[PDB]
């Protein structure tokens, strides 16, 4: 009977005193397969009237109704099907993608309704055709002229071949050449059965229509008709977006390298600073341990032997001194001490070899005659000359001299000959990694298992091990709360880059919308183009770093770049998940509302 | 004689074969005071021709005169005269700033020209009566129909009252009332010998035309005359500038917070890092300071009393030792040792205050039998009782126990009381400043100078402060890199965000150009725009930081975040100075090219 049916139907914009009534109790039927064409004065309510019924806007009050149902009841998913096969909308500003060309922005409604592309194109050309613009199929809106723009905009409304026509002013930029062919075409679509309701101002225009309605002051004057009425009778979606998306990432060339940018860093700083934490930590805690042992003095042998059978001990020393008088040349030091000490004593205590050699084993087994020399008792009995084989004597007793170590006369002789060949504690050099307090009370424990009551007067020498964990807690302190910040600024860097350049294509989807595409067919090509765009600048971020490491490396002599494999998953996880959330949130706000609001 | 002369005018676009011959040697004198109507059809080359003569575009070839003038010749401050007094556009798309009302769209074109703004808004008030949106001067653009965005780009070309006023067809979305309103006012002004080139389609329009030409193919068909023709006869800059980007920045409220929130985190990231850097230093070198001192031990008192009245040796000790037997209860502990030592030993080596006193300067004057016990002596003798007060029996000899110390038996008496009271070296502490090899050198000067030739054996223990400034220049280089990274990483972040931002209106650019703005007048509100939201977003960066700081310092009880002055300002001045380099680059680019490019 009637396809459009408009009763009670108002419309107010604004917030009183800036609050305008609009449209005001518009009751209108327009009848199947009509020619209708509005006219009215600049700014009576025709452009709005239009929208609410092409679906775009929607009424304040009162029913719209398209085949008899209610618009406002419909789903969201219904509408855009409508405004994919039911409505064909011609703007009147004529709302172009300006990246595409002409052709495109055509065939763009029939991918959301899913036709191949292949036909696209060839129907796209030929409607482009048809209505002069053949020659310029590859212009983007940008390179044609108005009245070029505004035919670009009636073949896309008939490129869904929707049965209502709602065409805005379609001749307002066109002479009467070009606008005549618009009208034999709008005419022979009348004749094939389809609606036309059609805003003009030009009265030939207005005279190829049968009903020639008048609105002035958001109210209908005028209702004419010449005749009566004859009586009527997601896979693929996603390749799709997925080309829409890359499309749209090469057409916004800056917007894009930017955003990636913005990811870039927010990796290779983050890891960056992770790395270079953990390598000063490495040479920090280095340097404190080059500067002295942890140890626990015991203060027989087979005892020292398997107190050395641990894993939680990693060297051990058998103790014997001497108190003496030594002789080289003339000179005849007095009271020099002749420290009896074991295999691994240098170890122990972190002496470091000098020059020649340490105690090895064959000289305690064999009771040797020989000293190794303290840097300070070398240099000042032998000058500046090499002291290697050169004799001393301890209590007139030859001793020849093997090597020389750091300090913390001093002399290293083994106990085996301060013990046969002078006179006739045990000392543990406890591991890095046991903690310990467990270890003095796993050594009273393990060695009282060898009966011994005592004397377990054990003295332990710590505090190395000490400011190692106090400053592993600080440089723990310093390099989290670096890494959190370092985190911190560049996922706020992502958001800035990612919530400007989609929100800067909040009319893009309102074109999208009023011309067919449902909600979800949005957040389709915005997450891929979040992902695709994440992605890459993922992968250039964790080789990105790879490069800055190997640079830093090869220029820094103090202290090495050492990545955590831990940190590059966190921060790429990080980056793009905060990266992915601020490109769909944007583009899934605009999606949801109203076209023309959108649109503006 | 002739206004406009436009001899052998040539036009491209495109790069062959993408390129189209436009306007095809177009020969046209205009007469001054005519009133002309340019007809055609759809993408001749009529809309391309009026900007070149409006100064918007510049011909591929051929001469262009305006008042004989050539205009390629002209400078760039000279055709923005033009463009703001000369001549007065109106646009085909009608080409509003879409944040101003319609009244500040129509006024704008005579800030560039100098008008007191009171003046302003009256007359623009009064151009919008004149055309019939007296009820809508506050309206946007956004807010009103077409027909209405047309009448407010006629007003606003009219605003500056230009003797030629080029109208791209102005009647195009109107009314034939409105539509003749604005012929009647055109004409008025022909009458007033005003200059009129109106392109236009309707003939009702082109009749009010005494000249009609008409184009075809981009090269002239018909030129017709009703008549012959009549012959013809810095400073508040900067104050409306600044308003101009103030209302700009609250007109574009995300991105500008975005832009100064983004400047926020590219200071407070980078002084958060400094000042994390040298809080974690002041506890890891306090961590290795008191691990042990560094001392020269020259191994008579008045040498050691010179000694101690240098700037560069904090403390000084008198030492001589003891080997004998103590005795408590009924036990005898044997081969004792008792330390004679100086007023400020504990302060040499470091040695801390437990419990009681240390040896003031009375016990060493009066050779007081008194000792101080180190923490294991202690603990042997006394169980885990309080051994201050109470006796011990070195050689047969009291010693009333007057405290504890740290350890690195042992026995700390004054040196007075051992040399007389039990038998009958000089060692310093090198300050924290002075350099040690300097001081090795500085000592053997300084005491040689008390005659004495030796032994100046003298010995210094020193390895804390070289794992000091070891790791001095470790944590040297990880603070310097972290805060290099951390600043370029919020350098590029504010880059983004503005370069952005910014070429996000080179349209509004171009409008600006095309109504008269001068290139300076772009540079000037844009420089304000910047140091504007760099400046705002400066101050609130470095007291941003300053909370931060406050909460650290509060909830953290390891090291305290120390702040550095010199940061603050380097942070502050390069992420301003970056910011206002890129917010000016882009605007300036824009404003540079020809106006109707940057419109698209
Ligand atoms: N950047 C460009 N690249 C290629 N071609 C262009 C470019 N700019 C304009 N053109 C072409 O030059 C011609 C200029 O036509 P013009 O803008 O004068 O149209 P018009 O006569 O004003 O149309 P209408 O009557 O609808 O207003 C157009 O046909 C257009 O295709
Ligand atoms: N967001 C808004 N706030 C306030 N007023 C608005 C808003 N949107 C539209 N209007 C007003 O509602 C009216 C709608 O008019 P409409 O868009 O139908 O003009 P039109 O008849 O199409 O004009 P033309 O004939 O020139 O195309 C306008 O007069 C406009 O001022
Ligand atoms: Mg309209
Ligand atoms: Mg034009």
Redesign the pocket.
């Known amino acids: 009977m009637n396809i459009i049916e408009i009763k009670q139907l108002n419309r107010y914009?604004?917030e009183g005193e800036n609050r305008?009534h609009?449209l005001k109790d518009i009751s209108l039927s327009i009848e199947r397969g009509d020619f209708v064409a509005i006219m009215?004065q600049?700014?009576?309510?025709?452009?709005?009237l239009m929208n609410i019924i092409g679906c775009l806007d929607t009424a304040t009050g009162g029913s719209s109704k398209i085949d008899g149902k209610e618009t406002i009841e419909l789903t969201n998913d219904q509408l855009s099907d409508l405004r994919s096969q039911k409505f064909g909308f011609i703007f009147?500003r004529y709302n172009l993608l300006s990246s595409l060309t002409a052709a495109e922005n055509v065939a763009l409604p029939a991918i959301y309704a899913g036709m191949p592309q292949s036909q696209r194109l060839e129907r796209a050309k030929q409607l482009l055709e048809k209505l002069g613009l053949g020659d310029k199929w590859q212009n983007k809106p940008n390179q044609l002229s108005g009245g070029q723009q505004q035919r670009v905009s009636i073949a896309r409304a008939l490129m869904n071949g929707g049965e209502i026509i709602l065409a805005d002013?379609p001749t307002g930029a066109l002479d009467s050449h070009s606008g005549e062919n618009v009208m034999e075409i709008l005419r022979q679509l009348h004749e094939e059965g389809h609606t036309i309701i059609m805003?003009t101002?030009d009265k030939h225009i207005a005279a190829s229509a049968n009903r020639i309605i008048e609105i002035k002051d958001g109210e209908i004057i005028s209702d004419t008709q010449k005749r009566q009425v004859k009586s009527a009778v997601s896979k693929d979606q996603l390749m799709e977006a997925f080309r829409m998306s890359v499309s749209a990432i090469v057409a916004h060339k800056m917007r894009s390298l930017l955003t990636m940018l913005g990811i870039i860093i927010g990796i290779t700083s983050v890891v960056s600073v992770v790395a270079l934490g953990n390598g000063s930590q490495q040479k920090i805690l280095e340097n404190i341990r080059g500067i002295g042992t942890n140890t626990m003095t015991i203060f027989k042998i087979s005892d020292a032997n398997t107190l050395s059978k641990q894993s939680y001990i990693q060297s051990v020393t058998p103790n014997t001194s001497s108190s003496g008088i030594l002789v080289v040349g003339n000179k005849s030091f007095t009271s020099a001490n002749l420290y009896g000490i074991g295999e691994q004593y240098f170890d122990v205590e972190g002496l470091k070899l000098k020059q020649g050699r340490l105690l090895t084993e064959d000289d305690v087994d064999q009771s040797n005659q020989v000293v190794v020399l303290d840097e300070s008792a070398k240099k000042a009995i032998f000058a500046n000359e090499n002291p290697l084989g050169k004799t001393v004597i301890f209590n007139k007793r030859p001793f020849r001299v093997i090597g020389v170590v750091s300090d913390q006369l001093n002399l290293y002789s083994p106990y085996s000959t301060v013990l046969n060949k002078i006179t006739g504690s045990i000392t543990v050099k406890i591991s890095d990694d046991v903690n310990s307090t467990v270890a003095e009370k796993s050594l009273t424990e393990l060695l009282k298992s060898l009966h011994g009551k005592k004397d377990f007067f054990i003295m332990n020498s710590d505090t190395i091990k000490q400011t190692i964990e106090n400053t592993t807690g600080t440089m723990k302190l310093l390099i989290s709360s670096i890494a959190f910040i370092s985190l911190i600024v560049g996922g706020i860097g992502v958001m800035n880059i990612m919530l400007v350049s989609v929100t800067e294509r909040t009319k893009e989807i309102g074109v999208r919308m009023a011309i067919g595409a449902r909600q979800i067919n949005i957040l389709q090509q915005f997450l891929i183009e979040a992902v695709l765009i994440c992605l890459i600048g993922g992968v250039a971020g964790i080789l990105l770093s790879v490069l800055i490491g190997v640079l830093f490396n090869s220029f820094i002599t103090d202290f090495s770049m050492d990545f955590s494999t831990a940190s590059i998953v966190t921060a790429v996880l990080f980056s793009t998940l905060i990266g992915v959330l601020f490109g769909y949130m944007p583009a899934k706000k605009a999606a949801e509302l109203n076209p023309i609001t959108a649109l503006a």
Chains 1, 2 share one sequence.
Do not use: L, R
């Not at 600049?42 to 709005?48: N, V």
């Open positions: 914009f604004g305008v609009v009215g600049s700014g009576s309510g025709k452009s709005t009147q002013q805003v101002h």
